Amino acid sequence: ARTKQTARKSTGGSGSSDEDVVCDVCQSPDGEDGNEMVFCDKCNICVHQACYGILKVPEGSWLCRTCALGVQPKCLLCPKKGGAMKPTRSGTKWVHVSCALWIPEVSIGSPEKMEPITKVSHIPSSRWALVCSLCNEKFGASIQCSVKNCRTAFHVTCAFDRGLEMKTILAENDEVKFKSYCPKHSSH
Length: 188
Ligand SMILES: [Zn+2]
Ligand SMILES: [Zn+2]
Ligand SMILES: [Zn+2]
Ligand SMILES: [Zn+2]
Ligand SMILES: [Zn+2]
Fold this sequence. Notes:
Layout lengths: L2 E2 L32 E3 L6 E3 H4 L12 H4 L16 E3 L6 E3 H6 L22 H5 L13 E2 L8 E2 L1 H6 L3 E6 L5 E6 L7
Antiparallel strand pairs: 1-2, 2-3, 4-5, 6-7, 8-9
Bound molecules: zinc ion (5 copies).
PDB class: transcription
Keywords: transcription activation, Nucleosome, pVHL, transcription
Assembly: monomeric
């Protein structure tokens, strides 16, 4: 499959194939050791292996789940269509991987496969009650700024699309903490 590669040829020039391409899930621009950035050959999103559950990069074509099934579903947790999505346990509904990761109560189940997406019902009612301060659509679940006593709310996908600071911290047991910061509190 087509992957984003960073290296320097003997011909000179840039050291990256797709310089403006980021992972659709975590928006990082770089592949990592054992963690290639793989393109979907239909919708052209690029995703880390570890962000989407790609155990091994296929030598042939690769399609994301929604393209492989020929569907364009909405996310249960936000109003955005398109992007890296995974199905619920029974296959009837779909959730953005980023929404699932950044909303704490959502479960991924298998770290290797990054699916099924479960425990959506464990999201407390307060996240559904909030109105995203970025798009103002009374739909889906919103998270809040990690700053002390800042309760500005936003969808995960809206946070990514509007340039908010979305931070991941890696700990020694290989768990990952997911933090988010409103515009006023973002570092950049
Ligand atoms: Zn990623
Ligand atoms: Zn696709
Ligand atoms: Zn979503
Ligand atoms: Zn929103
Ligand atoms: Zn804030």
